[PDB]
């Protein structure tokens, strides 16, 4: 029981997906499969052989080596990270909960509701909630009355998130008014969100801190920034999700704390996360 089924999800620079070479996976990439449907009038599909690289993938490679396990990596096709719909978990969390995966590796936010259904490793990347705006935008943070009471402004401040992840869950639980106002500014993803910001179609984008900090540090012309000194609300971290009472957790926690201690972790941050903008 050394060959583990592992789920991932594409989110640069943590997890990056590529097409296989002209005929396997080269260099720093590992093989990863994605089930692709034949049509939408069927359940029939084929697992396409793809290649995976990125910060979280380098962490997987180190754990595989240290903790001594081999794996079969696949990309989730049901949800994304994890959402409880009518008490049924989807995404990476669902895969672990319904035992299709031994572990979920990726830009997976540790939160209380997910922790009730899966076991998380120690956090290996600091995250939380940040706000991306065009440099100069006057907003104190999530608690700003531009967000909390948007209709007190003429015209009202335009802000959204990418729904169904830990960010929206957190806004839903803490700012009921803000949440119901934001939903008309829901973004299909990070790339759409940044385009709306850069083209004056959005005023602020609220999202995962680690991803927003990476995106501002690599912004062309260093126009888009995170409010404060790249400040983090509801500070949390990314964790590897494991089944509850999993035997793999102990070994995985010690290896991660070893990687931090050794300097191995700072090397990955240098390699994948460092930016030009400051």
């Amino acid at each position: 029981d050394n060959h583990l089924s592992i789920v991932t999800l594409e989110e640069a620079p943590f997890v990056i997906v590529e097409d296989i070479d002209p005929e396997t996976c080269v260099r720093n990439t590992v093989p990863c499969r994605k089930f692709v449907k034949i049509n939408n009038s069927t359940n029939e599909g084929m697992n396409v052989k793809k290649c995976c690289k990125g910060f979280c993938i380098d962490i997987l490679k180190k754990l595989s080596r240290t903790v001594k396990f081999t794996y079969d990596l696949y990309l989730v096709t049901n949800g994304k990270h994890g959402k409880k719909v009518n008490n049924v978990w989807n995404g990476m969390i669902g895969e672990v909960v319904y035992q299709r995966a031994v572990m979920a590796v990726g830009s997976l936010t540790i939160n209380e509701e997910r922790s009730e259904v899966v076991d998380f490793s120690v956090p290996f990347v600091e995250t939380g909630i940040s706000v991306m705006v065009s440099r100069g935008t006057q907003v104190t943070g999530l608690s700003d009355k531009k967000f909390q009471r948007p209709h007190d402004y003429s015209p009202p401040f335009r802000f959204g998130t990418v729904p169904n992840g830990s960010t929206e869950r957190n806004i839903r639980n803490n700012y009921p008014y803000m949440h119901q106002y934001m939903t008309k500014f829901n973004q299909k993803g990070v790339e759409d969100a940044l385009v709306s910001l850069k083209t004056g179609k959005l005023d602020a984008f609220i999202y995962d801190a680690a991803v927003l900090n990476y995106k501002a540090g690599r912004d062309e012309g260093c126009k888009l920034v995170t409010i404060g000194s790249g400040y983090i609300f509801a500070t949390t971290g990314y964790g590897i999700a494991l089944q509850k009472g999993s035997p793999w957790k102990r070994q995985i926690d010690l290896a991660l704390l070893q990687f931090v201690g050794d300097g191995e972790m700072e090397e990955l941050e240098t390699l994948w996360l460092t930016g030009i903008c400051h």
């Binding site: 209380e112 956090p123 500070t235 971290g237 931090v260 300097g263």
Partner: protein, 284 residues
């Protein structure tokens, strides 16, 4: 016949303040900047801090970021408790006696003297091997505390990387910073200089930087940044190296470990943890 949790803490401002009780055995009534009353607890502990001396246990007053967290955890999980300060005044390391033994709060927890560690206790591989840590209630790192004027680039400064009896730098004996410099061969030159000048407690080491006895003090940034914002004669130098978290310590068999972490997660998510940072750290 007691189901009351034994809590071990350590004096470490701004997380745990330790003041004497009033002549009648109570805590002086105080108030935060927001006019709210400062929540205080009676914490027993030694008065004679000297090494190799008898320890006369006395009731003292405890308050701070970690006490407010304890009170929140106790209310949420519906447990009763009693607070005592670590008898030897140490965080805790595993030292060779053939046999290896844990000291400090680590020692106290493993021996059953404590049922829980509620302090700014660093999560590391060495301790995680023997005890259960909760999810972090604070992420921070290491930095250097010097007297205003003393110029250092950081951990990669030749006055540190190439030690000499000219520039005396240290940390705290039997702490996580002590474990960090010892385990890493890359920092063995620094560790060997340090081992000869390490202080019993951070307060002693902070006063040593004031009374010109210590040049640089390598310690937790949550503590150091707070100390530099209060005592304007001291400033922190460099950025952060060995970024680490503080967690609640329990035995691997604790029936509280799951609910302790869920409570910490809830507190980060609802702003309670940010409020503690506002009340105890983010000021002046």
């Amino acid at each position: 016949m007691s189901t009351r949790l034994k809590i071990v803490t350590i004096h470490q401002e701004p997380f745990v303040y330790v003041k004497p009780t009033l002549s009648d055995g109570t805590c002086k009534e105080e108030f935060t900047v927001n006019g709210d009353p400062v929540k205080k607890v009676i914490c027993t502990g030694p008065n004679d801090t000297s090494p190799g001396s008898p320890r006369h246990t006395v009731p003292q007053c405890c308050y701070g970021f970690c006490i407010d967290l304890l009170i929140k955890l106790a209310r949420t999980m519906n447990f009763t408790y009693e607070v005592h300060l670590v008898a030897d005044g140490k965080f805790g390391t595993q030292e060779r006696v053939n046999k290896k033994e844990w000291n400090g709060m680590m020692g106290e927890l493993l021996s059953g003297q404590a049922d829980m560690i509620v302090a700014p206790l660093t999560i590391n591989n060495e301790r995680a091997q023997y005890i259960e840590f909760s999810k972090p209630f604070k992420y921070q790192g290491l930095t250097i505390l010097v007297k205003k004027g003393t110029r250092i680039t950081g951990i990669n400064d030749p006055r540190l990387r190439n030690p000499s009896d000219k520039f005396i730098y240290a940390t705290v004996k039997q702490s996580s910073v002590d474990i960090y410099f010892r385990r890493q061969v890359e920092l063995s030159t620094m560790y060997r200089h340090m081992e000869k000048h390490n202080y019993e407690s951070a307060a002693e080491a902070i006063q040593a930087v004031r009374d010109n006895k210590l040049h640089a003090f390598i310690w937790d940034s949550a503590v150091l940044e707070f100390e530099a914002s209060q005592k304007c004669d001291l400033v922190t130098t460099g950025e952060l190296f060995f970024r680490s978290g503080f967690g609640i310590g329990m035995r691997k068999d604790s029936p509280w470990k799951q609910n302790v972490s869920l409570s910490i997660l809830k507190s980060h998510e609802n702003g309670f943890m940010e409020d503690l940072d506002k009340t105890w750290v983010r000021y002046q």
